[PDB]
Structure 1
Amino acid sequence: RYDTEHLHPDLWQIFDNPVDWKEQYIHENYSRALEGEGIVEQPCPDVYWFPLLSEQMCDELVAEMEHYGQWSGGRHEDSRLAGGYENVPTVDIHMKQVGYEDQWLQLLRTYVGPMTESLFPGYHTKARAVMNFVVRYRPDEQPSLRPHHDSSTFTLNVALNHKGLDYEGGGCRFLRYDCVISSPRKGWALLHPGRLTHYHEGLPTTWGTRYIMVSFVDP
């Protein structure tokens, strides 16, 4: 079976050919970081920084999302949420709309799980997530966010383009530690608990556009 009615049909091949999918899309340094020979960094207390996705997957995902066009989001009230009201709105494209939800859940179950288990000993995960999306930060439509918390055990923050080449902005700023992240990488992922002890707030961007992929795993 092979669905050809896609811009980039190979992205949906995580269920038929896992091995070739891993070789092509997953970052080449992921295995070394998992086995524990460095790579993974802790710039600030209890936040981790490891590579997950290569350049092909980032580019392909960004192009596929931009092909959708309907960049919903911005209003305080919501229609995609059962409650019907957002605490803080952003322009986002949830994966349920584009059909990539199940494959993303499979990726979370397969690759993110074991590493976050090794990073935090004594924690057992099922990688069950409900909210996962991609946000677009542009100086024209909407600026960065106000300080807030998250409704999850921990959050995964993956970038999807290069800093300086296509945008000039910043990452995250932690209020309780005066920690500022300056230059996030392209395929690297950020891990941090997001319920109690991490009062973070994203920095504003002034030039160009930037892409970020978020997923509130273990709600």
Structure 2
Amino acid sequence: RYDTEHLHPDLWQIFDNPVDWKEQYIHENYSRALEGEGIVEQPCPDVYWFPLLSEQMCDELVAEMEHYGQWSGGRHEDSRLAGGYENVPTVDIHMKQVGYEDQWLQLLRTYVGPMTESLFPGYHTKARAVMNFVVRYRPDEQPSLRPHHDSSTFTLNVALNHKGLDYEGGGCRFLRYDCVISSPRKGWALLHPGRLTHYHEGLPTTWGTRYIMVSFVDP
């Protein structure tokens, strides 16, 4: 079985060929980082930064998102939310629309969960994520979000573009720790709690557009 009615059939080939898809899409340092040889960075307290995604997978995801076209989001109300009122609006394409929610959940249960288990001892993971989407911020379409927390036990933020080369600006601004990650990594991702002890704030971008893929796990 191979879905030929798609731009990148190899993106969904994780189910049919997990070994080949993992080798082609995951970061080269993902195994090294998981083995416990440094790699993971903690610029802020109770924070992490490890290489997860590769250039090819990021390019394929960006191409699929661009081909989707309907970049909804940016309204106070929410059509995909049961409550019907989103506290924070953002222009993004949900993983449900692209059909990659199942594949993303499988990848999180496979690779993301072991990293959380190793980083946090005594913590068991089930990889339950209710919100998963990729947001693209533009200098005139979507500005930096207001300082708000996350309604989940852990939050993962994965960049999809090179800093400066693709978009000019900054990253996050942790008010509690007085820390700003102004050097985002395209291949690396951060996984830190955001429920109570993290009031996250995003910095603005001047030139270009930066794509961020963030999912709310354990909600």
Instruction: Give the TM-score, by structure 2 length.
Output: 0.99
Q: Secondary structure at the match of 2:93?
A: coil
- How far is 1:177 from its partner? 1.3
Shift of 1:176: 0.9
Q: In structure 1, how many angstroms separate the alpha carbons of the residues matched to 2:38 and 2:74?
A: 40
CA offsets, 1:26-55, max 9 Å, x none? 001101100101100111101100011110
- How many Å separate the matches in 1 of 2:172 and 2:163? 14
1:74-112 per-residue CA deviation (whole Å, 9 max, x = no partner) reads 110111111101001000100001111100000000000
Question: How far is 1:200 from its partner?
Answer: 1.0
- In the TM superposition, residue 182 of structure 1 has moved relative to its aligned partner by 1.0
Give distance in 2, aligned partners of 1:145 and 1:74. 11
Shift of 1:159: 0.3
Residues 162-187 of structure 1 deviation map (CA, whole Å, 9 limit, x = unaligned) = 01111101111011111111111111
Instruction: Please state how far the C-alpha of 1:215 moved relative to its aligned partner.
Output: 0.5
**How many angstroms apart in 2 are the aligned matches of 1:44 and 1:150?**
17
RMSD: 0.6
Cα distance in 2, alignment partners of residues 105 and 135 from structure 1: 18
Q: Show structure 1 runs of 4+ deviating over 6 A.
A: none
1:136-190 deviation per Cα after TM superposition (whole angstroms, max 9, x unaligned): 1111112101100111001000001101111101111011111111111111010
Distance 2:210 2:142 in 1: 12
Q: Distance in 2 between the 1:28 and 1:74 partners?
A: 35
Q: State the identity %.
A: 100
Q: Structure 1 unaligned segments of length 5 or more: list them.
A: none
Taking the aligned partners of 2:145 and 2:79, their CA distance within structure 1 comes to 21
Aligned partner of 2:152 in structure 1 is 152
Q: TM-score scaled to structure 1, two decimals?
A: 0.99
Displacement, 1:114?
Answer: 0.5
5+ residue gaps in structure 2?
none
Counterpart Cα distance in 1 of 2:16 and 2:9 = 12
Secondary structure class of the residue paired with 1:206: strand
Aligned residues: 219
Equivalent positions of 1:78-97 (< 5 A) are: 78-97=78-97
Give the Cα–Cα distance (whole angstroms) in 2 for the partners of residues 107 and 19 of structure 1.
Answer: 12
What secondary structure, in the 3-state scheme, does the structure 1 residue paired with 2:118 have? helix
Q: Is the partner of 1:123 in helix, strand or coil? A: coil
Higher strand share: 1
CA distance in 1, matches of 2:157, 2:38: 20
SS in 2 for 1:33: helix
